[PDB]
Design a protein around this motif. Sequence first.
Motif, mmCIF file in Angstrom:
data_model
loop_
_atom_site.group_PDB
_atom_site.id
_atom_site.type_symbol
_atom_site.label_atom_id
_atom_site.label_comp_id
_atom_site.label_asym_id
_atom_site.label_seq_id
_atom_site.Cartn_x
_atom_site.Cartn_y
_atom_site.Cartn_z
ATOM 1 N N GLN A 112 0.819 -1.210 0.000
ATOM 2 C CA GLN A 112 0.000 0.000 0.000
ATOM 3 C C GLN A 112 0.876 1.294 0.000
ATOM 4 O O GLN A 112 0.544 2.237 -0.714
ATOM 5 C CB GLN A 112 -0.910 -0.012 1.227
ATOM 6 C CG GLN A 112 -2.380 0.145 0.927
ATOM 7 C CD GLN A 112 -3.203 -0.240 2.128
ATOM 8 O OE1 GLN A 112 -3.493 -1.423 2.371
ATOM 9 N NE2 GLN A 112 -3.583 0.757 2.916
ATOM 10 N N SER A 115 2.598 1.670 -3.516
ATOM 11 C CA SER A 115 1.546 2.088 -4.424
ATOM 12 C C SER A 115 1.375 3.615 -4.437
ATOM 13 O O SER A 115 1.421 4.226 -5.508
ATOM 14 C CB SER A 115 0.248 1.399 -4.044
ATOM 15 O OG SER A 115 0.529 0.023 -3.853
ATOM 16 N N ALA A 132 -2.351 1.579 -8.683
ATOM 17 C CA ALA A 132 -0.997 1.095 -8.417
ATOM 18 C C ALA A 132 -1.023 -0.094 -7.461
ATOM 19 O O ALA A 132 -0.269 -1.045 -7.667
ATOM 20 C CB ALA A 132 -0.129 2.212 -7.856
ATOM 21 N N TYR A 133 -1.904 -0.053 -6.440
ATOM 22 C CA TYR A 133 -2.063 -1.126 -5.449
ATOM 23 C C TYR A 133 -2.614 -2.417 -6.097
ATOM 24 O O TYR A 133 -2.255 -3.533 -5.698
ATOM 25 C CB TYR A 133 -2.963 -0.635 -4.295
ATOM 26 C CG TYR A 133 -3.339 -1.690 -3.265
ATOM 27 C CD1 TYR A 133 -4.444 -2.517 -3.456
ATOM 28 C CD2 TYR A 133 -2.641 -1.805 -2.067
ATOM 29 C CE1 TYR A 133 -4.785 -3.492 -2.523
ATOM 30 C CE2 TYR A 133 -3.011 -2.739 -1.101
ATOM 31 C CZ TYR A 133 -4.081 -3.586 -1.337
ATOM 32 O OH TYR A 133 -4.456 -4.518 -0.404
ATOM 33 N N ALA A 136 0.194 -3.875 -8.321
ATOM 34 C CA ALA A 136 1.192 -4.480 -7.436
ATOM 35 C C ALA A 136 0.732 -5.837 -6.930
ATOM 36 O O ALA A 136 1.476 -6.803 -7.065
ATOM 37 C CB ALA A 136 1.511 -3.544 -6.273
#
Length: 347
Positions: A112, A115, A132-133, A136
């Motif tokens: 997190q 991200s 982004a999280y 990932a």
Amino acid sequence: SHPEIEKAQREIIEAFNAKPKNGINKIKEICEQYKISPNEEIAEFFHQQRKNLDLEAVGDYLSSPEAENQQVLKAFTSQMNFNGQSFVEGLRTFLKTFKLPGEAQKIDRLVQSFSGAYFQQNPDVVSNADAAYLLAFQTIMLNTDLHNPSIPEKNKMTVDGLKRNLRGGNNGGDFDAKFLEELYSEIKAKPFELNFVKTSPGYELTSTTLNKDSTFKKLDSFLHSTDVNINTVFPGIGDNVKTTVDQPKSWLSFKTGYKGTITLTDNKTSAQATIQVYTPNIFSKWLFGEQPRVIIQPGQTKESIDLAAKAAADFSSPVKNFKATYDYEVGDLIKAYDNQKKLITIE
């Protein structure tokens, strides 16, 4: 890197290594004394004295949910360059930085943080921080699939298999097909260098036959239970104990073993304790350990150490590993465990 801290670096290293709390409080000590901000500074020392510090503890400090800790991390992660770096590479670097905590929620807080920083430094690469999280967690799940020696090459996730899961992932939209090919290939040619913690904090119950254990068996039934009392699982703890249950996220127990976290809280004493369940599956077995695990950890409050000991003593299987918590030394946890294991070993 402030000079008053830099001066007594060896002293702060000696204190932190011995007991993180001591060292942290010794960083805060200098910060108070010189009218400076600890969060921004703890983060710096952690970075600077990496080759010197207990990386298990550092990773453990940064992955903790406490406000101060959560801030320190925001500052730690912000002090990293992700500008120019490929999503796969930026993440490749991030994970490499830690002695990765051996617990899902702790890992999550970490993922997190990356991200939020990768998106700050690259606002054009991913649509938003949530995107982004997602990417990932897909990348980390991808890392398991692409490098699992048990799974046959024909069942290992394809390039277009990636694009599918990610339809509506870029802030309610698709990511660039050429970027996902550059993602998928980069992580196909090189797996993530992931070094985990040896033994995670508190009591760890782990055996090849823990799945057989009555207490474990009961505790698992409890995770998919509505309005049931915990004294049915642990009769060694009080009647007056409230429970909250956090079930695993999008990435299921199949891709971690992580079956969830139970939080026990004494409604008269405010003693708190958390139980964590991990059951090895085909995907997990290869990366996250082939034997079931039960991690019991006491809260910061008084008597939390007893609640944790009472829950662990109720288990038939023994506690394979004992590890000091930020506020509790290894011995005190042993003292309370053997005590309850001698106490509960009566009709």
